[PDB]
């Protein structure tokens, strides 16, 4: 788990990510709604008009609106630009558990302990439909992301799928005559014909707390007080249980599909978040807290960001490191995308898959080192336990067929980091923090014991940069001597100029630019996390934060070039063009 | 570099 942001507050019952802004709404048990910027780690605003716990919260996808639903039986619709409640929807008779906006229609879906699901038109401020049929508290109701379907979860031990296609036809038909249906009082005790139960999913032994649709497949995930997460498949005529994920030891509060991977995330009152493989139904990862129960899970629609609400606040996290593994040499970019090593020529813009990587690494490639002389690549993979870290040595085939890239047999071995030192030799940092020099056959040619070395970086032919806790040392591998040292804590990336005259040392919040002797020329402190950088042909270091493209000159002058909507990894800068990789490993050019 | 001192003098001053 890569924690990005963490809040301390009263119990978080609801979470919603803003689709475009780096914002998250948190609804608290004390009636307060908090709006946070998770990039800046700041509270933007607070909304406190609800009389008691707020459980339902959702951002509108396009409008400057959010909806909240509380134990006060009120649904409030808010304009976050105006920082005011626009109106309150009244009609539920008991606690509102969930509130969601429809993705196309001006509808709000609400689920309540009154055993009803209500659809509201937020433009007309009217209840348009009441879904009746659950015999207990309706803990969750969600719209299908593309179809006129609703899924609901209830303490009646059932998950129900509702067809709302009738509701759409009635409200969108332009020829609906002025019939004075002053029908205030006709709560037709017989369920309104506009929404029909399509499927009833029975199989939980206790109350169901959450249900969610799969974003693209006809799958439903449900979490219940039976401590099970169930996967359901539906078609037009039938729905059935596919399988059950077992391993929670208390009530499952929320379960969601991963929006981009075949993974299920569930959280539970057992103080754990579990990640499940959707195909194998096995627990891939488990995250625990010592004292705080989990209540709600949210996934960001467009980013690999998750949020979990617990008794003591909220966590915003990532499952995986989205940083692409890449190496730049001259006009060629080598980068890893999925299972393929790709080669991009910056001049021709030709992006070709050069080879297929060996299947079976559970962990993404952490770093890559390219050797242009032997056309060989070192791919470093870090395990969750650093001692189990591996590197793969591949030779890139010359005749790469772009449609069917060859799968060369890579030599896998144990090591923390592997970096090229010479044309026919590479250095490996072993699990024992010892420096192993290997040949192209992966044979140990020299063993060098280095005190306090956590990481190694390339520093020219025969030289390495060794990172300790508080310094970087330039080390000659042949002479086994330290040449120079610079004080900088926890350097993550080292970027040399094209002529090797200058080096940029990238820490989490600091950039130190040094000359070839490791004399510090400038030190830049950033409040925002530094992501990547590249040297321009002019000798300017262009770097990226999470929010900006910035420049730094060797004299210490630095500034903002451009705001970034998404964090990007700079690969090369040429004139007015910044070549970069996005978090999806797509090459982009920014002017 | 911020440290809370918990000396007998600081306790006696706080109690005074």
């Amino acid at each position: 788990m890569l924690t990005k942001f963490e809040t301390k507050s009263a119990r978080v019952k609801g979470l919603s990510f803003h689709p475009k802004r780096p914002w998250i709404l948190t609804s608290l048990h004390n009636g307060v709604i908090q709006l946070w910027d998770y990039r800046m780690c700041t509270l933007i605003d607070k909304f406190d008009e609800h009389d008691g716990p707020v459980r339902g919260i959702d951002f509108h996808k396009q409008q400057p609106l959010f909806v909240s639903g509380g134990d006060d039986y009120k649904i409030k619709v808010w304009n976050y630009k105006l920082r005011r409640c626009l109106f309150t929807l009244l009609g539920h008779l008991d606690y509102i558990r969930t509130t969601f906006f429809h993705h196309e229609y001006p509808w709000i879906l609400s689920a309540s302990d009154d055993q009803t699901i209500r659809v509201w038109n937020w433009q007309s401020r009217t209840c348009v439909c009441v879904l009746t049929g659950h015999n207990h508290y309706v803990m969750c109701a969600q719209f299908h992301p593309s179809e006129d379907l609703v899924v609901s979860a209830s303490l009646d031990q059932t998950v129900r799928v509702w067809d709302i296609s009738g509701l759409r036809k009635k409200n969108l038909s332009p020829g609906a005559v002025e019939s004075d249906v002053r029908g205030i009082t006709g709560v037709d005790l017989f369920g309104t014909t506009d929404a029909v139960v399509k499927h009833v999913l029975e199989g939980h032994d206790r109350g169901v707390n959450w249900a969610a649709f799969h974003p693209t497949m006809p799958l439903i995930v449900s979490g219940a007080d039976d401590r099970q997460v169930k996967i359901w498949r539906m078609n037009e005529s039938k729905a059935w249980e596919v399988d059950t994920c077992r391993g929670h030891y208390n009530n499952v509060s929320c379960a969601v599909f991963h929006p981009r991977q075949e993974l299920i995330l569930s959280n539970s009152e057992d103080k754990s978040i579990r990640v499940w493989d959707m195909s194998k139904r096995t627990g891939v990862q488990t995250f625990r807290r010592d004292h705080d129960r989990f209540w709600v899970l949210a996934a960001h629609p467009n980013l690999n960001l998750f949020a979990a609400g617990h008794d003591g606040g909220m966590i915003v996290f990532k499952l995986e490191r989205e940083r692409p593994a890449y190496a730049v040499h001259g006009n060629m970019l080598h980068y890893v995308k999925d299972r393929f090593l790709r080669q991009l020529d910056f001049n021709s813009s030709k992006d070709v898959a050069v080879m297929q990587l060996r299947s079976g690494s559970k962990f993404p490639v952490f770093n890559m080192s390219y050797n242009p002389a032997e056309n060989a690549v070192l791919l470093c993979t870090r395990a969750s336990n650093l001692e189990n870290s591996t590197y793969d040595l591949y030779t890139i085939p010359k005749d790469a067929d772009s449609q069917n890239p060859d799968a060369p047999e890579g030599k896998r071995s144990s090591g923390l980091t592997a970096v090229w030192v010479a044309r026919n030799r590479f250095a490996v940092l072993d699990r024992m923090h010892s420096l192993l020099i290997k040949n192209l056959k992966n044979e140990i040619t020299k063993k060098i014991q280095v005190p306090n070395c956590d990481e190694i970086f390339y520093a020219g032919t025969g030289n390495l940069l060794l990172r300790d806790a508080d310094s970087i040392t330039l080390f000659d591998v042949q002479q086994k001597r330290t040449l120079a040292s610079v004080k900088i804590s926890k350097v993550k990336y080292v970027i040399w100029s094209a002529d090797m005259s200058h080096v940029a040392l990238l820490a989490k919040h600091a950039i130190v630019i040094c000359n070839r002797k490791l004399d510090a020329l400038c030190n830049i402190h950033e409040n925002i996390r530094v992501k990547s950088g590249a040297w321009d042909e002019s000798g300017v270091f262009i770097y990226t934060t999470s929010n900006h493209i910035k420049y730094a000159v060797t004299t210490g002058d630095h500034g903002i070039i451009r705001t970034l909507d998404l964090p990007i990894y700079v690969t090369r800068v040429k004139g007015n063009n910044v070549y970069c990789l996005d978090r999806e490993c797509r090459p982009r050019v920014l002017t | 570099g911020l440290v809370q001192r918990r000396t007998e003098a600081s306790r006696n001053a706080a109690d005074k």
Binding site: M40, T42, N527, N547, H548, G556, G559, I560, I561, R562, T563, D565 | G1, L2, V3, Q4, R5, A9, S10, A13, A14
Partner: protein, 243 residues
């Protein structure tokens, strides 16, 4: 010259250029922000969003403006100072473009740093009062000396100038070249907050005559913010002289 207080907030490649004139008064900070539309598009609801860090409070939220193509406007914002703490003002310029699906709705401003030195005045007390306050004060900040200065007296004078603190230790007690110096410093804020510092510095004889001054500065105050802000100011001043 007003020019010495002009701080550039955005770059020339930004769709909205901004610069601020920062005027620090005794209890309030006036930001006069020039905003220039560098685009051919009409910027609707162009809003200066300010956020403060420390004991700074924004008095009024800037109103949204509409900027014509290549038009300019001044936005004044007042920030109140409640205590003697290091403040940082963060901001964004947010705008809506009519009709163009531009992905850029936000320009991020440069951080504006408020200096604690405008609130600190040199003060005098007796050695007995200093020792009593030094024992009684709850918050200590220990700053490690990290300077390129080789003279102990030049380093003390640099700290006195950079902190606006008065040296209480008499010149005779500082006299003579022994490679060791200790001095007591005292200041008061305009809010009546007492700040004490002890400077304990040495010349590391084993590193030669060109060795930089080494040691510790201890700052004591009743408030956490005062001790923290003075410590950060001393750390920043020492790093500027290392260039």
């Amino acid at each position: 010259s007003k020019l010495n207080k002009v701080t550039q907030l955005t770059g020339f490649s930004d769709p909205v250029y901004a610069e601020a004139y920062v005027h620090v008064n005794q209890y309030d900070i006036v930001l006069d922000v020039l905003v220039v539309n560098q685009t051919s598009d009409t910027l609707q609801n162009c809003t200066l969003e300010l956020a403060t860090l420390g004991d700074l409070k924004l008095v009024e939220k800037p109103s949204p403006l509409t900027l014509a193509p290549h038009d300019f406007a001044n936005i004044k914002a007042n920030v109140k100072v409640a205590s003697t703490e290091n403040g940082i003002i963060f901001g964004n310029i947010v705008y809506d473009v009519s009709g163009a699906a531009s992905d850029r709705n936000c320009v991020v401003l440069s951080d504006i740093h408020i200096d604690i030195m405008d609130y600190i005045q040199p003060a005098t007390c007796t050695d007995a009062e200093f020792r009593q306050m030094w024992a009684e004060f709850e918050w200590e900040n220990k700053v490690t000396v990290n300077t390129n200065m080789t003279d102990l007296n030049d380093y003390l004078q640099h700290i006195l100038k950079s902190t606006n603190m008065k040296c209480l230790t008499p010149e005779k007690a500082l006299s003579g070249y022994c490679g060791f110096m200790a001095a007591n410093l005292y200041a008061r804020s305009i809010f009546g907050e007492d700040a004490l510092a002890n400077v304990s510095i040495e010349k590391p004889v084993h590193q030669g005559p060109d060795a930089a001054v080494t040691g510790h500065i201890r700052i004591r105050a009743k408030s956490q913010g005062m001790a923290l802000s003075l410590g950060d100011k001393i750390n920043l001043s020492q790093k500027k002289t290392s260039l």
